[PDB]
Design a protein around this ligand. Structure first.
Ligand SMILES: Nc1ncnc2c1ncn2[C@@H]1O[C@H](COP(=O)(O)OP(=O)(O)O)[C@@H](O)[C@H]1O
Ligand SMILES: Nc1ncnc2c1ncn2[C@@H]1O[C@H](COP(=O)(O)OP(=O)(O)O)[C@@H](O)[C@H]1O
Ligand SMILES: Nc1ncnc2c1ncn2[C@@H]1O[C@H](COP(=O)(O)OP(=O)(O)O)[C@@H](O)[C@H]1O
Ligand SMILES: [Mg+2]
Ligand SMILES: [Mg+2]
Lengths: 232, 524, 524, 524
């Protein structure tokens, strides 16, 4: 909450971006009617950081370091650009890379529980040039998939995958067989979004059965393949 | 969280202590021999202020029942500042006086609702008497006076404000912001001005000025980005055939088109400049239509089906001169027409009726000022930041107070107007005895502003109060000179709008508070 | 968490201490000389209120057993506010009166279940006597008193509500919202209107009005987004051949179609305007069918398989006049017919009877009001938010009381209606002596509201209670002027539904409370 | 969180206790027999320093009401440094003297605003006489004295800075940076130099010094990366025909072209060197345009519709010599015309007047220096790091003091100027007797600097203050040698700008604080 101190349009985008002083998020944000836009954008920046709701204290009032700030705002183009202190994104112990739980918590999640923001679609952001290497960061990605597929680590291109036909209700081993069949085809698959431990096809048997189907399909094709288990 | 509850005098006693703490803090800012309050803000240096509402906003007490009292009278200081800027302490001092008498009246066993109805009747009559006392304020001397008094007797501010409102006229907008010199300065902006500069240095034809100046240019008004020179070629050809220069006003000029224009101008084939449109969104559209109206030009837009490939010198507007800088553009004597301007001004003035948002209304006021007046900046000169922030706040009050005088008139200051009206209502009566005492509460408490003004001098208030009530008309006591005289000839004036507002809102909150019988709050 | 448990008299005494705290906070609000309660809300300014339930919701005690006492009788305030919206303080006092005397009967060794059965019998019969005393209320003068009385003796709200109910009529809807002036003002909306404005300014044909006006227009009700004007051409061709203007109502018009209409309007070939359909979801489709029905048009949808290329001026609706603004659309005299509208109203009337939610019932009443009546908005005027938020809650009180009176009639206020029924039941007896005492507790408690109303005035309650019981008929004590008279002649009226409500809910809770033998709760 | 508030003498005493704690921490550093202060820092060695304001920044009291006093006088100590470099302790002593005498005078009952106006008048009159007392400083010896005194009697610094200013001339830029030896050393850089080296080692043609040197070279100023040798071929062909060596300055040279130049240079086909352009952004284009101006070349750039393939030997600049190293490039005697260069200087000098940002002004000042004046670096010699920072902080002061002397003159130091002007204003009077006390308050406190200078020596201060007032003119007391004499002949001079500044900013802050009547801050 609050707009005071949260309006900080004096912050230069150059030191924020190229100086890396802040993570910089550009929102197409529209308030609800009658709210002050800059207050909403600044108030949205508070939700995008410390919260600072009704009151903040540390046995002796105040709290002022954690705040993510609006640094460009312009009501009629619906633009809300918010600069976030790098301290907001606490480092994960596994790698020293910032927990993205914070970032979502501070952009498109608990911060969006603000109601007088009608919407705040982030169209873009920036992350500090150096500390970017210490954002949570995809230690595995397409480039590592290429590597396990035996492709070059540069432009290993399309890792082919499917949504298993015919989507829901396909039992684990028919689903695994559809994965096998697909993996007599291409490279990659996911579980469906309801195909967690839901009783129509739980994860463990499906993933056990799908994993066998992958090895079978690999053995029958001579090329590596991949499955995406619905851990949700 | 479990609540705590109190009843009756054990409740009301807690309430009164709260109000007294806040009011006692605020009182000391009152009048010309008042003193400053220092406010702690942990972010930086403390801020010294005389601004009543600034002090009132911070006060909030530890003991929860005590805190509740301060939080109520905080409402009156906020609104009076929101309603009319100046007047905040006087409204507070009035509100505290009525509360203390009301608890006095309730302890005598009056029914509190009849007291409220009594108070509301006295205020209703008192406002009508103030409207009868008001006399017009209509010249620089009267305006310079009220400016001086609101500035806390700083004649330089009063003089300066009279000049500023004279130059920009009643439709003009006046503003104040932090200067750099050791003395004040007045800048007046005339014609149209907006915060967009040249898009490249090479347009600069007067590098000694550091600026672009063009004589009798065409002005093009493109409602979109400019992307390829192909969209403009016939215009530059048509302009080149006419030989006069051209100003592009557009949402953007992309580098290749821009560079091609930069090339052609430096090599002298045709003389051109380009600027981004001011603002954004719908207000940009309005402002683009405003400049078109002022220049007599036409807004080129695809929503009406126009094409730059079909634009002509009839669609472009004109002006006698334009000047553009690294950051700034000005258009001098646009070739619009008066009937169109007043019609356009009438539209915006009607929109000013529709603008419920005050900030947006100010923007509409700025837009009409651009079309029909000027804009001025007062630069505050002071040696130090703790004085910059003090001096600035006094100029703020002087601007609001001078504004408030012109539309409603002025009355003798020093509270003597509010003393006089209290003598006229002496025949007013209620339906029942409880309403009579409720009426009398108002007539007694209205003396409180003069009493506090004098008390800050260390004079004896009741001795002066007795003699001022013995006076006639505008006879009153001047606390600066410590002698009596005619307030109009002595130049001590108050805007009728602030004095009337300070009473109305004060009686509103107090008229409730005397009726409080129970309070519920969380255990500490 | 380990609980603490108590048994027998130790439980009941702590529970009784709980109820009295919540009761004593509300009681002080009762009657015309009641007093305000101040409610703390740390997230903003404290709330000043006279509303019983608004105080009752805030009470929560630290002692877990005392917390149970407040938390039990709080049910009565919530149910009374939902069922009738007025009388909650009255309903609370009756509940607290029965509980105290009931526990007294338990301490005498009476079997609690016979008190419950005895109480329930007496209250059941008492409601039958209220059906006999109620008289119809059916004129503007009668309604104005119950409004004024429930408003706490303010005629202006009563006079205003008496006008509002007359203008919108029996099926109309009335609403109250925060104004900005000091005076109250009543707005009334004729015909059907909804909060959608012009999709562009270029439709504006009254630029000074900021509005679109078209006469005898066709109205198109497209149940889809209008994408390509090639879809519109055969309809627009027919309209252009007719030369009459057309209003488009659609789920959207995309820019190429919209812009082409904007182009076509500027050059004056056909007068057209486009607006979003009101609402969203199936109610949007319903409102489109309603607009069609009111206008005599037909809804065009791909669900039925009709298509714009096949639509005709026979499918389009018509009306005598339409007006649209930046935010608002209204239709004047649709070419619908009384039989079709009434049949549609019957469908919605069946839906209102079927509506399990008052929100749905509200959303249903709005459309029949738009179809067959109108809507009124009362904007409350006040000088400040605390008074504003106070004032509105008293207007709300009158608006439900006036509604409640029209469907149930009125009886003399001041509790005297309860006194007169408390005499008629004196012959009632039960199956056993414990039930006879159960009757006696109830018949004794119905005197409690009058005694509190007197006590808040500072008068001796039993002297007034004796002198009223010595009278007959509507003879009662006028607490506003401290005299006896006919309450119907004095205009002091309560809606029969609130009194009949306040009993039944109060006796339902209090008749359970006293059978409590044990309490279990978590240790502190 | 809950505030605490205090009024009147209880607040004012707590305020005064705060100021004196900060003042005594600063007081001990004043004058030639002053002593060092040890400042704690959480992450390293304690910093030994003599600089007054550097102590003043660290002070921060535990008691909030005391803390507010210190945190205000820190503001005058900071600003006096920002305005003038040296002159912090003097401003802090003057402020603390007036506040004590002002608050002392307030206890007598005088109106604080008449005191404020009285002080403000005295300071305003005093500045006029100081502007009259100031005398020109021009010769190297006079500059050497003010350098010596500011250095705290380290004559070597005055001699060294006097030579540095003599070599670079009054347009030049002098800076100080860490050395490594015991001795202070002066490095003067002349012509143009910028911090980019050879892009590859293989260009090195004097490996006996790791250096590239070229004589009468052509210089290419490429505004963009060099990426395809066909960009260069036509120039390289023409350069090869001329046979003179070539220097490339470019945004970059890609490996293909760069390595191909390495091949052609190693094999001796063309004498070529390439360097990265200095910096980035518009400052690069500006700096490149400066080099073009100095060299008579042209910035080959797309914005002017030019291509490297179209550039010619007429477009390349020339200079007598260039030298480039691993990290540094220098250009000797560019062929640019003095009138063109002078005009460019006038452009950049005009930018200095418009540049409000001081950091930009140094950037602009370096470019006018490197075009038209010397660049100098002073390397401070010290035996160890804690001695390094101390010694460095004294050298830093001699620059600001010597610079300050050149533009505004000097007056007799040792506070004597303040003593002499105090004797002239004794006839000054105000509007009222409280203002008369206000005039006399200021004229009293101006002795406070001299008394501390003597008291830090341990001499009896009021004796020396009497004898100095017994003398006339530049007669004064030389605290370094415990004898009276003419301050001009001993060279104890202070810049007028620093003495005048310390008085103004002290009076500005002190005159506000003594009007304090209330303070509000958080409970501990
Ligand atoms: N020279 C003076 N003599 C007597 N009263 C004065 C004089 N100058 C100003 N006043 C009074 O000071 C009162 C306080 O107004 P102001 O200083 O603006 O504080 P606020 O408006 O916040 O109460 C005004 O009613 C004004 O008439
Ligand atoms: N002038 C009056 N004389 C006697 N009784 C009155 C008068 N005005 C109101 N009442 C009584 O006060 C009660 C209504 O007060 P109210 O604050 O609305 O309580 P509740 O919230 O329970 O409705 C009713 O019983 C009504 O008859
Ligand atoms: N030999 C001296 N005799 C008398 N006064 C001196 C002597 N040397 C320096 N001073 C004075 O000491 C005062 C403070 O100088 P300095 O310590 O540089 O100020 P700061 O501590 O603010 O840098 C000046 O008024 C200066 O003239
Ligand atoms: Mg009620
Ligand atoms: Mg010094």
């Amino acid at each position: 909450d609050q707009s005071s101190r949260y309006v900080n349009l004096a912050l230069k985008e150059e030191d924020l971006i190229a100086g890396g002083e802040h993570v910089l998020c550009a929102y197409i944000m529209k308030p609800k009617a009658g709210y002050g836009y800059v207050a909403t954008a600044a108030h949205f920046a508070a939700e995008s950081s410390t919260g600072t709701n009704v009151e903040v204290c540390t046995t002796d009032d105040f709290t002022r370091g954690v705040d993510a700030l609006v640094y460009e705002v312009d009501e009629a183009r619906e633009l809300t650009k918010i600069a976030y202190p790098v301290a907001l994104f606490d480092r994960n112990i596994t790698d020293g890379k910032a927990m993205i739980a914070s970032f979502l918590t501070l952009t498109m999640g608990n911060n969006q529980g603000m109601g007088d923001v009608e919407y705040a679609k982030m169209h873009d952001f920036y992350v500090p040039e150096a500390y970017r290497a210490l954002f949570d960061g995809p230690s595995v990605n397409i480039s590592a998939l290429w590597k396990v597929l035996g492709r070059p680590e540069v432009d290993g291109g399309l890792v082919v995958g499917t949504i298993i036909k015919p989507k829901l209700g396909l039992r684990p081993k028919p689903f695994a067989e559809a994965c096998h069949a697909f993996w007599l085809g291409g490279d990659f698959i996911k579980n469906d979004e309801p195909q967690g431990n839901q009783p129509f096809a739980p994860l463990r048997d499906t993933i056990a059965l799908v994993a066998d189907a992958m090895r079978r399909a690999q053995d029958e094709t001579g090329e590596a393949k991949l499955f995406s288990a619905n851990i949700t | 969280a479990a609540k705590d509850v109190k009843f009756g005098n054990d409740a009301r006693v807690k309430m009164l202590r709260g109000v007294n703490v806040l009011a006692d803090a605020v009182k000391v800012t009152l009048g010309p021999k008042g003193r400053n309050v220092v406010l702690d803000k942990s972010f930086g240096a403390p801020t010294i202020t005389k601004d009543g509402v600034s002090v009132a906003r911070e006060i909030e007490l530890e003991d929860k029942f005590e805190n509740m009292g301060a939080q109520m009278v905080k409402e009156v200081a906020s609104k009076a500042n929101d309603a009319a800027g100046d007047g905040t302490t006087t409204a507070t001092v009035l509100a505290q006086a009525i509360i203390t008498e009301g608890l006095k009246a309730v302890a005598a066993g009056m029914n509190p609702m009849d007291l409220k109805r009594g108070i509301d009747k006295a205020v209703t009559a008192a406002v009508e008497e103030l409207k009868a006392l008001s006399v017009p304020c209509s010249d620089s001397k009267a305006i310079a006076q009220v400016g001086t008094i609101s500035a806390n007797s700083d004649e330089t501010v009063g003089k300066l404000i009279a000049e500023a409102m004279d130059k920009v006229g009643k439709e003009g907008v006046i503003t104040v912001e932090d200067g750099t010199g050791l003395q004040d300065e007045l800048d007046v902006v005339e014609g149209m001005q907006f915060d967009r500069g040249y898009l490249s240095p090479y347009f600069i034809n007067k590098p000694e000025t550091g600026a672009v100046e063009l004589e009798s240019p065409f002005i093009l008004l493109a409602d979109k980005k400019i992307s390829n020179i192909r969209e403009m070629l016939p215009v530059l050809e048509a302009v080149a055939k006419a030989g006069k220069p051209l100003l592009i006003i557009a949402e953007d000029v992309e580098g290749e088109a821009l560079a091609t224009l930069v090339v052609n101008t430096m090599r002298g084939i045709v003389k051109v400049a380009a600027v981004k449109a001011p603002g954004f969104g719908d207000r940009r559209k309005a402002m683009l239509q405003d400049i078109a109206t002022l220049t007599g030009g036409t807004v080129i837009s695809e929503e009406i089906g126009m094409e730059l490939e079909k634009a002509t010198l009839e669609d472009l507007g004109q002006a006698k001169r334009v000047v553009i800088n690294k950051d700034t553009t000005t258009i001098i004597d646009g070739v619009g027409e008066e009937a169109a301007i007043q019609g356009r001004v009438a539209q915006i003035r009607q929109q000013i009726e529709e603008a419920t948002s005050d900030y947006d209304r100010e923007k509409l006021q700025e837009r009409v000022a651009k079309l029909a007046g000027g804009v001025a900046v007062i630069k505050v000169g002071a040696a130090t930041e703790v004085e910059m922030k003090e001096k600035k706040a006094r100029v703020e009050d002087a601007l609001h107070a001078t504004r408030a005088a012109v539309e409603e008139g002025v009355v003798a200051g020093g509270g003597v107007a509010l003393i006089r009206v209290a003598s006229k209502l002496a025949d007013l009566r209620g339906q029942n005895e409880d309403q009579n005492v409720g009426i009398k509460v108002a007539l007694r408490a209205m003396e409180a502003p003069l009493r506090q003004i004098v008390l800050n001098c260390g004079e004896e208030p009741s001795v002066v109060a007795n003699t001022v009530k013995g006076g006639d008309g505008n006879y009153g006591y001047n606390a600066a000179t410590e002698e009596y005289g005619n307030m109009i000839d002595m130049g001590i004036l108050d805007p009728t709008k602030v004095t009337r507002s300070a009473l109305q809102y004060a009686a509103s909150v107090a008229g409730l508070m005397i009726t409080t019988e129970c309070m519920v709050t969380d255990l500490p």
